[PDB]
Design an enzyme around this catalytic site. Structure first.
Site, PDB file in Angstrom:
ATOM      1  N   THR A   1     -18.518  -4.025 -55.642  1.00  0.00           N
ATOM      2  CA  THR A   1     -19.785  -3.544 -56.166  1.00  0.00           C
ATOM      3  C   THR A   1     -20.984  -4.440 -55.955  1.00  0.00           C
ATOM      4  O   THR A   1     -21.951  -4.031 -55.339  1.00  0.00           O
ATOM      5  CB  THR A   1     -19.642  -3.184 -57.639  1.00  0.00           C
ATOM      6  OG1 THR A   1     -18.604  -2.198 -57.713  1.00  0.00           O
ATOM      7  CG2 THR A   1     -20.940  -2.628 -58.255  1.00  0.00           C
TER       8      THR A   1
ATOM      9  N   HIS B   1     -10.883   4.766 -60.439  1.00  0.00           N
ATOM     10  CA  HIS B   1      -9.853   3.766 -60.665  1.00  0.00           C
ATOM     11  C   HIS B   1      -8.672   4.330 -61.463  1.00  0.00           C
ATOM     12  O   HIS B   1      -7.571   3.977 -61.189  1.00  0.00           O
ATOM     13  CB  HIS B   1     -10.390   2.554 -61.419  1.00  0.00           C
ATOM     14  CG  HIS B   1     -11.172   1.616 -60.556  1.00  0.00           C
ATOM     15  ND1 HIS B   1     -10.565   0.698 -59.730  1.00  0.00           N
ATOM     16  CD2 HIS B   1     -12.502   1.444 -60.404  1.00  0.00           C
ATOM     17  CE1 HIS B   1     -11.504  -0.001 -59.109  1.00  0.00           C
ATOM     18  NE2 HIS B   1     -12.679   0.429 -59.504  1.00  0.00           N
TER      19      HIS B   1
ATOM     20  N   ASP C   1     -23.653 -21.592 -30.818  1.00  0.00           N
ATOM     21  CA  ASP C   1     -23.635 -23.065 -30.914  1.00  0.00           C
ATOM     22  C   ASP C   1     -24.455 -23.751 -29.825  1.00  0.00           C
ATOM     23  O   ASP C   1     -24.482 -23.324 -28.641  1.00  0.00           O
ATOM     24  CB  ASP C   1     -22.213 -23.582 -30.730  1.00  0.00           C
ATOM     25  CG  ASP C   1     -21.290 -23.239 -31.897  1.00  0.00           C
ATOM     26  OD1 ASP C   1     -21.722 -22.690 -32.945  1.00  0.00           O
ATOM     27  OD2 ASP C   1     -20.068 -23.510 -31.731  1.00  0.00           O
TER      28      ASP C   1
END
Ligand SMILES: *[C@@H]1O[C@H](CO)[C@@H](O[C@@H]2O[C@H](CO)[C@@H](O[C@@H]3O[C@H](CO[C@H]4O[C@H](CO)[C@@H](O)[C@H](O[C@H]5O[C@H](CO)[C@@H](O)[C@H](O)[C@@H]5O[C@H]5O[C@H](CO)[C@@H](O)[C@H](O)[C@@H]5O)[C@@H]4O)[C@@H](O)[C@H](O[C@H]4O[C@H](CO)[C@@H](O)[C@H](O)[C@@H]4O[C@H]4O[C@H](CO)[C@@H](O)[C@H](O)[C@@H]4O)[C@@H]3O)[C@H](O)[C@H]2NC(C)=O)[C@H](O)[C@H]1NC(C)=O
Ligand code: XET
Ligand code: CA
Ligand code: CA
Ligand code: CL
Ligand code: K
Ligand code: NA
Ligand code: ZN
Length: 802
Positions: free
Chosen positions: A159, A265, A688
């Site tokens: 969330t 859920h 890099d």
């Protein structure tokens, strides 16, 4: 300390927060346990419910009521949202025909269309189709506005990482909210979903939309809502704010619903109990739209309907337990669930060794439902590594599963969870845009949530803070206020070397059996001056966006940009038609490497270093297997086409080059391929510099890439060959980790046709990911609009079904 004896009268849902100990009346006061004594009485009224009825029409204003049905309510801005329907014969917004909103139709004194972000927790992408019969207001928004089939969340699909990504345009590694719980070892503190430490401002990086707005003079409503403030009250409050005077009225607002996540859920994404939460969210949308319509704002406000993540079927019995793998299980701390993060239980335990942990977790059970990774080896598409709050050891968990430390931690309650890999279909969420600034009845392709911050800035006339969106890649969602960027300027121009060195100047320990006519002598010179380049360089050469020294090398079958600093190509470009043939490497050329007489011995690799380096071998960027002719095949053995490869990775690379490239040319009616190395030793997702390189080929200055990329482009209309395409392009790309073993692939002892493609799908990438990692800018010369190209550069091929 809160001196809670002050009053909230005339201060209900005050926008400006007031400093302790003075009591607060803002939409968070409950969350700090700091509201004035009279807050519930004055600010959370409920008497008579949320709807006008016939008998209340024209009533005498009674200030105890939750909302009003009196004659003065519209001017005051506090009518029940169904007032004009019940009392004035008007229709619900959902029962009105959709009509194009060509221009904002706003009351006088509005300086810009307001934006309301209607955020819904756990709203999985397939709910739009599967719940359509029970969500008529949402369906009207969707079909009349601009929508995507789905929106891709960020990893982890939790969330706060997603809501805060929406707010900032930043990956979790950059904004700092890397999970629903976290330990910061610099602060020595913990962040949790519940509790108070999350309110400390030091967790939250970047610049969220509400701050971006404030700093640029655009006022914002408060985005955060305490759990106890009922949804109807959230809506009524936004409607009241929108009724404020011009000088006080905010231009941006958020609503939040805890549903359908909360039910998901308990019951699973599609449990029969899910219909009611979907109905209730739809009702809330209806209340907002009727509410806006009464205020004459329903063709003025831009509304965004957006979720944070989806929801998957997960139960207690699909738990893997680290205690089945590790004997030392009490010497570690696990952040558990739909991902895993491991660190030492104690930093004074000098025995704790991450390498032994990884090894004990690698391919131990035949159906193992998690895979361990050092965080730098995670798929680069997740951008989940460059933060001290991300533990070195990570577990990527299979969809439908949990990981836990020991069985005692799990003792079933729940049937749904989320958090998995952000490409998983069940974790996808929604986007709908509705209003004057969005397009009318328009479907757009899926896109990532990191892109929305830029668009919300465009909707409000704001300059976005630096972020990870690609500004302009979503211009196709917008009727107006598009952002028209210019291509980045090339920083280094290339050299175009001719033939400058004699073969005997090279002492590289390289050998090749190649001591082997004026028609084909002029023909090969032209190939070296760039006569086939239009075939192999379809979209122009890539632009180098940093200061460096490099050369363009032309050949019959491929063109390359060769770095004199890294001693290898930054990029190699070639086109393989549908009709191209695969040939084998002749025996006379098996360990052939030839000096390139355009490039000095001093800026060349050497074979001796590879002979001495017992761990490192080499491969080629242009594959010798796809040479156009036997004479062209010698070009593929140039020392300037060679790159360092571990023998384990060579199995991967060889299968890609010998089998897959031709397969894609067949399927896609030709492909253009650009391949090259990536060096990202500090796992920041960015190219890099020379001084960041941690590994060289033994005894040499030849730097070892951390990854190898390929960008495979063709015509979206596949009836046109890749090299003669009139219209939009199609792309897929990969960033493959350059690893000395194939421990990542549990089936790697089998034939490459059983495991390489699966590895490559896992390491699918956006072109834009490659750009950050290389400092190159691709697709510089097409006949397409730049915004369309930006959309293409953000495309991710996910390899999930519909
Ligand atoms: C996604 O988009 C974002 C946003 O564009 C990209 O992130 C940016 O990347 C930039 C390049 O790495 C980076 O620039 C550096 O900023 C340093 C100053 O940073 C502070 O101020 C800014 C501005 O307000 C702020 O945004 C920063 O916020 C970070 O840090 C706080 C904690 O303090 C966190 O709350 C917040 O979440 C955020 O953390 C993230 O970024 C940091 C790095 O800044 C990471 O470490 C975290 O893990 C996390 O990812 C800061 O508050 C500045 O000091 C840097 O300059 C050094 O390097 C340059 C090289 O040019 C050198 O010339 C300078 O002199 C300096 O070197 C000296 O310091 C070195 C390091 O200590 C030292 O080794 C040397 O010896 C030198 O003495 C640099 O300019 C920018 O901060 C971030 N911004 C954000 C929000 O993250 C990101 O790259 C994008 N991702 C992709 C894949 O494209
Ligand atoms: C879409 C973007 C622009 C956005 C919307 C909102 C919306 N408002 C909001 N209000 C409260 C909560 C809340 O309470 N949520 C989530 C889990 C928990 C915390 N717990 S709890 C209350 O049990 O502690 C439920 C969440 N969203 C907030 C936001 O800011 C942020 F990212 F920082 F979140 C950004
Ligand atoms: Ca959520
Ligand atoms: Ca880097
Ligand atoms: Cl987490
Ligand atoms: K070797
Ligand atoms: Na293996
Ligand atoms: Zn949830």
């Amino acid at each position: 300390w809160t001196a809670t004896s002050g009053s909230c009268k005339g201060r209900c849902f005050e926008l400006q927060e007031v400093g302790p100990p003075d009591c607060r009346c803002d939409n968070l006061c409950k969350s700090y346990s700091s509201c004035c004594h009279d807050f519930d009485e004055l600010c959370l009224k409920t008497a008579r419910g949320w709807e006008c009825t016939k008998d209340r029409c024209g009533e005498v204003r009674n200030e105890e009521n939750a909302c009003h049905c009196s004659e003065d309510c519209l001017s005051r801005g506090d009518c029940c949202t169904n007032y004009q329907v019940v009392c004035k014969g008007e229709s619900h917004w959902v029962d009105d025909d959709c009509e194009e909103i060509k221009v904002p139709e706003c009351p006088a004194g509005f300086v810009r269309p307001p934006l309301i972000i209607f955020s819904v927790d756990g709203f999985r992408a397939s709910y739009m189709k599967k719940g359509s019969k029970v969500m008529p207001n949402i369906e009207k928004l969707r079909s009349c506005g601009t929508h995507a089939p789905y929106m891709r969340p960020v990893y982890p699909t939790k969330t706060f990482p997603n809501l805060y990504t929406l707010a900032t345009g930043l990956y979790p590694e950059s904004h700092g909210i890397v999970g629903n719980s976290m330990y910061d070892p610099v602060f020595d503190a913990s962040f949790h979903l519940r509790g108070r430490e999350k309110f400390n401002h030091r967790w939250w990086g970047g610049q969220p939309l509400w701050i971006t707005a404030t700093k640029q003079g655009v006022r914002a409503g408060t985005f955060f809502w305490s759990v106890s403030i009922p949804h109807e009250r959230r809506i009524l409050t936004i409607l009241q704010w929108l009724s404020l005077p011009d000088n006080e009225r905010p231009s941006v607002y958020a609503f939040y619903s805890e549903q359908p996540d909360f039910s998901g859920h308990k019951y699973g994404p599609f449990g029969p109990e899910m219909t009611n939460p979907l109905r209730e969210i739809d009702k809330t949308v209806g209340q907002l739209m009727d509410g806006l319509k009464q205020l004459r704002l329903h063709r003025c406000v831009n509304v965004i309907f957006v979720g944070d993540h989806g929801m998957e079927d997960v139960t207690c019995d699909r738990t893997e337990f680290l205690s089945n793998y590790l004997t030392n299980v009490d010497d570690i701390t696990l952040v558990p669930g739909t991902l895993g993060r491991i660190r030492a239980k104690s930093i004074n335990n000098s025995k704790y060794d991450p390498k032994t942990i990884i090894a004990a977790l690698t391919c131990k059970k035949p159906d193992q439902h998690f895979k361990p990774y050092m965080k730098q080896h995670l798929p680069k598409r997740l951008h989940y590594a460059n933060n001290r709050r991300i533990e070195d050891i990570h577990l990527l968990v299979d969809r439908r599963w949990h990981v836990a430390r020991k069985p005692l931690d799990v003792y079933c309650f729940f049937q749904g969870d989320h958090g998995f890999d952000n490409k998983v279909n069940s974790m996808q969420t929604v986007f709908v845009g509705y209003g004057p600034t969005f397009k009318y009845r328009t479907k757009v392709p899926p896109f990532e949530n990191i892109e929305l911050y830029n668009v919300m800035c465009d909707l409000l006339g704001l300059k976005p803070a630096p972020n990870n969106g690609t500004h302009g890649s979503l211009n196709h969602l917008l009727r107006t206020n598009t952002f028209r960027p210019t291509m980045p300027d090339e920083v280094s121009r290339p050299n175009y070397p001719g033939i400058m060195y004699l073969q005997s100047e090279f002492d590289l320990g390289c050998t090749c059996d190649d001591k082997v006519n004026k028609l084909e002598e002029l023909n090969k010179r032209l190939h070296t001056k760039g006569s086939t380049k239009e075939r192999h360089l379809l979209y122009g050469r890539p632009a180098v966006l940093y200061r460096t020294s490099y050369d363009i090398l032309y050949h019959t079958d491929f063109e390359s940009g060769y770095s004199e600093i890294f001693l290898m190509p930054l990029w190699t470009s070639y086109t393989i038609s549908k009709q191209a043939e695969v040939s084998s490497i002749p025996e006379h050329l098996t360990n052939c490497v030839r000096p390139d007489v355009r490039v000095s011995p001093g800026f060349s690799q050497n074979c001796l270093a590879y002979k001495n380096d017992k761990q490192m071998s080499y491969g080629f960027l242009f594959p010798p297997y796809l040479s156009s002719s036997p004479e062209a095949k010698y070009d593929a053995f140039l020392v300037t086409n060679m790159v360092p490869m571990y023998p384990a990775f060579k199995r991967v690379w060889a299968y890609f080059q010998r089998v897959l490239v031709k397969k894609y040319a067949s399927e896609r009616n030709g492909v253009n391929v650009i391949s090259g190395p990536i060096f990202d030793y500090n796992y920041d997702g960015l190219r890099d510099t020379e001084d960041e390189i941690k590994q060289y080929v033994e005894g040499s200055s030849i730097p070892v890439p951390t990854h190898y990329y390929s960008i495979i482009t063709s015509c979206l209309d596949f009836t046109q060959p890749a090299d003669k395409c009139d219209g939009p392009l199609s792309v897929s790309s990969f960033i493959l980790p350059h690893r000395p073993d194939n421990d990542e692939s549990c089936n790697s002892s089998e034939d490459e046709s059983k495991w390489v493609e699966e590895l490559m799908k896992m390491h699918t990438a956006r072109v834009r990911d490659i750009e950050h990692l290389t400092g190159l800018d691709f697709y510089r010369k097409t006949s397409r609009s730049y915004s369309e190209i930006l959309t293409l550069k953000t495309y991710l091929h996910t390899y999930e079904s519909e």
